[PDB]
Amino acid sequence: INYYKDAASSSSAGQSFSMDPSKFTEPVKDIMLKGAPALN
Amino acid sequence: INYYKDAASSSSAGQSFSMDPSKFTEPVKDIMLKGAPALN
Amino acid sequence: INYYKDAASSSSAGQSFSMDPSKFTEPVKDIMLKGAPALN
Amino acid sequence: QTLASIKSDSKHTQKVPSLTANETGATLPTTPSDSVETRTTLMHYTGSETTLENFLGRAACVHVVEIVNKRPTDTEEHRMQLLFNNWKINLSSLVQLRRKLEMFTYVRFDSEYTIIATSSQPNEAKFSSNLTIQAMFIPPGAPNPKKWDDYTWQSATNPSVFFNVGKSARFSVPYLGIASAYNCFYDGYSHDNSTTPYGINVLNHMGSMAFRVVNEHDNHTTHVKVRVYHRAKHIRAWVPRAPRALEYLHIGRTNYKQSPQNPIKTRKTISTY
Amino acid sequence: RAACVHVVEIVNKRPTDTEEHRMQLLFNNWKINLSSLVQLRRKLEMFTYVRFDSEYTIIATSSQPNEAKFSSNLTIQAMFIPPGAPNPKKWDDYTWQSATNPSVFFNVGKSARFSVPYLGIASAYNCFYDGYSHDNSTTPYGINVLNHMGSMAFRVVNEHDNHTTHVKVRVYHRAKHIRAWVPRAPRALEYLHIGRTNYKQSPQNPIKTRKTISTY
Amino acid sequence: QTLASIKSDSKHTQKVPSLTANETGATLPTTPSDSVETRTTLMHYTGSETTLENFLG
Amino acid sequence: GYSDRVEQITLGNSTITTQEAANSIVAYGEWPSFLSDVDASDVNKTTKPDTSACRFYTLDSKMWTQGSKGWCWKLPDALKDMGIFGQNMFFHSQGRTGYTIHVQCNATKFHSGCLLVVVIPEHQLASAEGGNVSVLYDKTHPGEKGIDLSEADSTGPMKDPLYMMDGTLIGNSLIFPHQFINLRTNNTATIVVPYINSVPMDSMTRHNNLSLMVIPIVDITATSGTTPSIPVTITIAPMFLELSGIRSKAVI
Amino acid sequence: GLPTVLTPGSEQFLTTDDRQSPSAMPNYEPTPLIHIPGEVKNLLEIAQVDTLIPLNNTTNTTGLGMYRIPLVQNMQGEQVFGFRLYLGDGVLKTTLLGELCQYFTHWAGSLRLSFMYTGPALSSAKLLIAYTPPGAQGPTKRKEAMLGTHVVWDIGLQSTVVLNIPWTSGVQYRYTDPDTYTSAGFVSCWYQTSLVLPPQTQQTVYMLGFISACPDFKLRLMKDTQSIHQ
Amino acid sequence: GLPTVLTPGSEQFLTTDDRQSPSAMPNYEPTPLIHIPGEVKNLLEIAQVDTLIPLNNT
Amino acid sequence: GLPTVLTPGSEQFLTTDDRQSPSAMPNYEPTPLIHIPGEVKNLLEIAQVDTLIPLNNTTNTTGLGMYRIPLVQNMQGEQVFGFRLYLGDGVLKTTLLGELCQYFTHWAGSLRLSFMYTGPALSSAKLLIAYTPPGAQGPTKRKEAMLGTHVVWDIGLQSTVVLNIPWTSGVQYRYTDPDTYTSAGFVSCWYQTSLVLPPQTQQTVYMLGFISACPDFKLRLMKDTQSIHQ
Numbered sequence A, B, C: 001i002n003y004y005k006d007a008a009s010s011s012s013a014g015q016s017f018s019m020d021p022s023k024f025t026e027p028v029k030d031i032m033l034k035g036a037p038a039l040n
Numbered sequence D: 001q002t003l004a005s006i007k008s009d010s011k012h013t014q015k016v017p018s019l020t021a022n023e024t025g026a027t028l029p030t031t032p033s034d035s036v037e038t039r040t041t042l043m044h045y046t047g048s049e050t051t052l053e054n055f056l057g058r059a060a061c062v063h064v065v066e067i068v069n070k071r072p073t074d075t076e077e078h079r080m081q082l083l084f085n086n087w088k089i090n091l092s093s094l095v096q097l098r099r100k101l102e103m104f105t106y107v108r109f110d111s112e113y114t115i116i117a118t119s120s121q122p123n124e125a126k127f128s129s130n131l132t133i134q135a136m137f138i139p140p141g142a143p144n145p146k147k148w149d150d151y152t153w154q155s156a157t158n159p160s161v162f163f164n165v166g167k168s169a170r171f172s173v174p175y176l177g178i179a180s181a182y183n184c185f186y187d188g189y190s191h192d193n194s195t196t197p198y199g200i201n202v203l204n205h206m207g208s209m210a211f212r213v214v215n216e217h218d219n220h221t222t223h224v225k226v227r228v229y230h231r232a233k234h235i236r237a238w239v240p241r242a243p244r245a246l247e248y249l250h251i252g253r254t255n256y257k258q259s260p261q262n263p264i265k266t267r268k269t270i271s272t273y
Numbered sequence E: 001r002a003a004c005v006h007v008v009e010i011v012n013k014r015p016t017d018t019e020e021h022r023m024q025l026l027f028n029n030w031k032i033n034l035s036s037l038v039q040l041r042r043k044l045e046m047f048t049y050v051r052f053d054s055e056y057t058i059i060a061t062s063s064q065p066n067e068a069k070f071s072s073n074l075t076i077q078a079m080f081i082p083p084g085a086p087n088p089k090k091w092d093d094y095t096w097q098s099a100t101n102p103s104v105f106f107n108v109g110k111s112a113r114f115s116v117p118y119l120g121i122a123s124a125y126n127c128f129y130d131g132y133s134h135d136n137s138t139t140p141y142g143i144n145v146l147n148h149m150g151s152m153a154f155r156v157v158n159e160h161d162n163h164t165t166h167v168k169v170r171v172y173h174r175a176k177h178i179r180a181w182v183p184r185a186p187r188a189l190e191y192l193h194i195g196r197t198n199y200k201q202s203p204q205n206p207i208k209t210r211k212t213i214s215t216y
Numbered sequence F: 001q002t003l004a005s006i007k008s009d010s011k012h013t014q015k016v017p018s019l020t021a022n023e024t025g026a027t028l029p030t031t032p033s034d035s036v037e038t039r040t041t042l043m044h045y046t047g048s049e050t051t052l053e054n055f056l057g
Numbered sequence G: 001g002y003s004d005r006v007e008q009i010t011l012g013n014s015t016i017t018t019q020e021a022a023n024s025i026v027a028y029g030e031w032p033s034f035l036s037d038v039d040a041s042d043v044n045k046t047t048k049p050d051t052s053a054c055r056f057y058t059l060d061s062k063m064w065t066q067g068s069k070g071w072c073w074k075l076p077d078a079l080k081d082m083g084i085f086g087q088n089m090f091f092h093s094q095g096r097t098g099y100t101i102h103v104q105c106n107a108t109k110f111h112s113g114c115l116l117v118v119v120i121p122e123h124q125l126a127s128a129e130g131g132n133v134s135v136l137y138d139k140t141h142p143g144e145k146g147i148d149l150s151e152a153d154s155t156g157p158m159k160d161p162l163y164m165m166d167g168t169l170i171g172n173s174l175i176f177p178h179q180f181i182n183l184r185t186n187n188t189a190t191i192v193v194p195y196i197n198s199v200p201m202d203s204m205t206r207h208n209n210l211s212l213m214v215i216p217i218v219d220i221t222a223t224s225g226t227t228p229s230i231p232v233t234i235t236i237a238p239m240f241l242e243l244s245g246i247r248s249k250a251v252i
Numbered sequence H, J: 001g002l003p004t005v006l007t008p009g010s011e012q013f014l015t016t017d018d019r020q021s022p023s024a025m026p027n028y029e030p031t032p033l034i035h036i037p038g039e040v041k042n043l044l045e046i047a048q049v050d051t052l053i054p055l056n057n058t059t060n061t062t063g064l065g066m067y068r069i070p071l072v073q074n075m076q077g078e079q080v081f082g083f084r085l086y087l088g089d090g091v092l093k094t095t096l097l098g099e100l101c102q103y104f105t106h107w108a109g110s111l112r113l114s115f116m117y118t119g120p121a122l123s124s125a126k127l128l129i130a131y132t133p134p135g136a137q138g139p140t141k142r143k144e145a146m147l148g149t150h151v152v153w154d155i156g157l158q159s160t161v162v163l164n165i166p167w168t169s170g171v172q173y174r175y176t177d178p179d180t181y182t183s184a185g186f187v188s189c190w191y192q193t194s195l196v197l198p199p200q201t202q203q204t205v206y207m208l209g210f211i212s213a214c215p216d217f218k219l220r221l222m223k224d225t226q227s228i229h230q
Numbered sequence I: 001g002l003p004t005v006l007t008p009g010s011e012q013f014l015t016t017d018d019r020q021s022p023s024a025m026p027n028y029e030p031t032p033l034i035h036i037p038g039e040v041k042n043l044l045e046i047a048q049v050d051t052l053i054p055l056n057n058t
């Protein structure tokens, strides 16, 4: 229950989210597949 | 009512359970019966 | 609302009960009636 | 409701529940009704009072530290001056608790801590002051405070609590074990070596809790004792064992005196009442 | 209704090595009973068998009857010591760890409050007992033989602080969920001791007299 | 529940997940099962403790 | 009549046959078994030596005579030098075992006496020197030669059976899986023990699971003749050996 | 905001006050629980396991001798052993019931004694084991012991006798600490016949005594033990 | 958390203030109540019993 | 009003106690959030990115030389490198896994090592990369290293080898701080064959080492690092 109507007052509520490491691990135009040559 | 969303914060809730002394009193492969010879 | 699950913790709840003075005022085998002789 | 006993009359049978063999290692669940004539009666008992949860889930003092508020002396390490103090986490320091935990081989639980501080001024004081006390967790790998007020105390990532003398802190700590349960005993070593510590101490990498008075010196020296209490919650335990009969000597170790007193009261004759 | 049951005095002083800590009042043991103070005893005495849950309130007040420089708010510990439990010997020995013994900490000026469920062995507490602990010519007589409630121990958990501080701890009791059986006449004569129903050798007849049977 | 690893037996294939090029700047999401024989097992972990919210909050 | 006094145990390529035995014990009521996917945390295909390892091994017998204090063996340490099991123990980084432990002691109807056989998990030992002294590796891992409680030492563990080896009393050791051998009734005792630990799998070299105590409660006597001497033989087998991780042979 | 009133007890610390509290580690994910054998739910599951009784705790019995009860040849009608039935400071003090009961104030329910014979297979004896209810003295003679609750034990193939001591108290609960008002009475054992060994032999044989709780066993009100000295 | 305001009387001790409180013995199971004759519910059940008057208290 | 009781902990300050509180700026309207690339949700999204390992952190290697592992001609069976596998105070201390792990107490899951060859296109070699599980020593010889978990790496068009180090611990979690009980063992690399360069040439060639987490990577219990000195 929220007791204040000013949203900053809200406790640190939130959900866990699925991770998306592709933004940092596979930022490539052409999709690389495991097992395929990296250098074609 | 729980006021915290971190489960460790929960009070010592729980149910009573039926006892199972057989784990400590009758750990035998071959079932012994009261009134039967222990040594057959 | 009870806040504790250990019954001793409950406040002094209870109902009023009809009084039963006959246990202390008329403990006799043979029922006496008002207006009747006590000594028959 | 569960019955304690059921009516049973004299028997003259070939079935003999009173005669068995302990050789087997089994204890058969015999009753008074298997020996003597009995009368039906209820237990009026559920056994709830003897649950493992009640046995272990009561607060107990675990450790006491002493810290002081004094003008720092530049000739000595601040820790040595008791400007702050480090308690290596364990439950084995005080026997009243240790003894219960020792009755199980593997124990799993969440913790609840309560920290209570009391001040004292054994000197020519002019007034009393209510000091603010800081308690901080320092898990393995975390920096250990060196000065009463160095950067470590910022508690940027380390859980910590502030409370006043005369007040108390309370918080929960979830099961922190690496394994599925805390080991009460360990019949082994940290590694395959001839020389290495033996026993449960090798598993105790719980870290330390640091205590500090966060106030500056105030003319006189104030002594603060901080008592830490612990209560287990949501308790599970496995493999029960016999309780220790002899006195404990040290933490972790199961050592005992060279010539222990036999903890069995004696009498003159086997038939003396 | 709450009633005072017992008052203990404990002090905070530098321990003296020549005397037992208990004798120095560094801690104090109250054997549990409700018969110490007559205002409560008298009501309970009106029933033969009484069953109830208890509520305790513990209130502490400090005093410094000396050349003090300052006052200190002490923390007071109260601990249950049921029969068979170890009795504290030193103001700070291992007993006070309270590993299994219910206990409460509170400050002077504050109070403790808690409930204790009916602890009787029998279905009700006996107010009177016309008998002995066993079949013997010489043995204690009366309700005292049933009183194995145990003791409550009190302690100042602070270390000495230059001056001697006296703390009185007052324990109040209130019964809840009360049942009682077999009512009896209230006592007319003064009480002498706990448990015992003894009275003075030559008691004052507790009936106000007058000159004539017809005097108004 | 999320698996940590799945059972995987000896391979003799032309597909080679252990051989790549970091030159590309990519880090491929390879697993222990791409190198050695493995056994099916659960993670029993959600990663909630490592959320940005706990790191900074 | 399939009498409970007669049993045959077949395990791997070895057997045990007894005619005078008490019902075998299954410690804590749980038969030994393999690690489940749910419990497992080690991401390696495991190795299951099967019947090449899960067979009976016999340890050197010891003489039980008047004055004997009893003996102690550690598992898996006792088997470290025996068969393929012993070799696997030093190549595999971790593993898990269950055991069948069988203790034998023969006598005639004219003998008296009683052994107490107990299996104690995590039996952390007290040092002979007390104080802050730890028992050295060399004295907790003797292999086939158990710890003879009858032998003097000053660097080893304490040897007085009244207090076991850890300050508890022997009278209460019966909380642990145990069985007695009364020479008048039975000459064998058998205990089956599941893997018991806080972790799925563990080192088989730096840590023991189970400590087998054999302590005489009643001295061997005889109705007539000189002090008797009766050998006591212990036979032990792994049940569901499961190993993981390959490394060069460990050096101790 | 909402008007409130504080009550006595505010800000007290109470050992047994089960309440919620903030977590110091807000999103911690505990290590998974693997199956571990031997799970314990209740202390009364332990109370039912037989442990040895140091009945021969006489002076000059250092060692395991305390757990051995001697029987001798040609003795008849004599007492083998006897003791006052306490779960506190008696011979049962160090047994598991002893150790468990020392953590509780109130004890109720039935106890089980058991004895095992360890002598020659060719030997024999009959023993009388008896329980003497509260209020009685001794017993000093077999003639007295036989008037209580008793069993006659024939030594044979089955080496163990079990005597379940019934609850005979007129008080619903008894104390674990010694207390005259709730004395449990006495336990004793007498030679019903005599110990007989093969011809021309002379030996002492022994029994081992055991104790455990009956399913009907109750404990209340926890307390600290007296087994800790620092 | 929830805003609150304390009122006069906070932390007072009052003889007749019936309130809930924590138990000191969390899972204790009280001794069963056997039937006992002479149960009393109200003092006015006692007030109705005749007692002697010391009228000749001269 | 409503009777209340205060509990222990009243008015404490606790670092991790997430609660509501009054706003100091009651009707403030925050600046709108425009789309910004590179949003991070979890630290474990970062742990999976490869960073360089200063494997050649020997004395007298000031500069970027610490990230270069030398290989030499005509050497066979010799060790290229080796290190003790810590995520605390080892060669991995300053890598992103190092830096992230220094904020946590417990570490579990698989690690990934990767090596990239930077020598002449005309050169070749085969290297053995091996992991030695806990309890072992060294390795000091290739004959020992080959008995652990290993990969043989052929230098060719694809310049990078990836070795996923499996979780082999018998303990569910290991410490990030060095601790004998949870040692992770060793990592080593040996010349399977030898380094071969074109005829009549003599050069030293180098490899770059990388480290990242596998998807199965777990961290628990946050703590302060030892990377701050004021």
Ligand SMILES: Nc1nc(-c2ccccc2)nc2[nH]nc(Nc3ccc(C(F)(F)F)cc3)c12
Residues within 6 Å of the ligand: D089, D090, D091, D111, D177, D178, D179, D181, D182, D183, D184, D185, D200, D203, D204, D205, D206, G198, J171
């Ligand atoms: N630290 C430990 N680790 C392990 C263990 C480690 C690896 C594998 C298996 C077991 N077993 C232990 N048993 N007792 C330990 N000490 C302890 C535990 C909790 C707390 C407290 F107070 F934080 F809860 C204080 C001290 C302990």
Ligand SMILES: Nc1nc(-c2ccccc2)nc2[nH]nc(Nc3ccc(C(F)(F)F)cc3)c12
Residues within 6 Å of the ligand: E032, E033, E034, E054, E120, E121, E122, E124, E125, E126, E127, E128, E143, E146, E147, E148, E149, H171
């Ligand atoms: N302790 C007692 N036991 C028995 C009794 C025992 C066995 C069979 C029958 C009756 N009757 C009693 N009547 N008054 C007693 N003293 C008492 C009771 C409660 C409390 C207090 F304050 F804890 F509630 C303090 C003191 C008492």
